[PDB]
Amino acid sequence: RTSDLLICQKMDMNVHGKPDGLPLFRECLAPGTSISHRVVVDTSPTARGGWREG
RNA sequence: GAAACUUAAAACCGUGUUGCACUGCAACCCGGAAUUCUUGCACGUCG
């Protein structure tokens, strides 16, 4: 849902620890959202189009 | 006995349908098998 998508700014810190605000504002997400994907592996033998060690 | 053509003239001709009825017809799937698939971060760089 679009209720949680805040706008950030690209800040480039250096070895002295002094960031600068570039003009690169972009609609990002926010820390706290959970994204859940599904991964499916295929246990057919190798050279049949499978990967038992994946 | 020696001497005088049973000769002359005359179409085997005229008329007449190899014609009348009859389906190259009945029955028959251009049908059965086959993934527009395989790999690929809308990303990198900030006096």
UniProtKB/TrEMBL annotation:
Function summary: This subunit might be involved in maturation of a crRNA intermediate to its mature form.
Spans through the membrane: none
Protein name (record): CRISPR system Cms protein Csm5
Subunit structure: Part of the Csm effector complex that includes Cas10, Csm2, Csm3, Csm4 and Csm5.
The gene coding this protein: csm5
Family: Belongs to the CRISPR-associated Csm5 family.
Whole sequence portion shown: 214 to 267 of 375
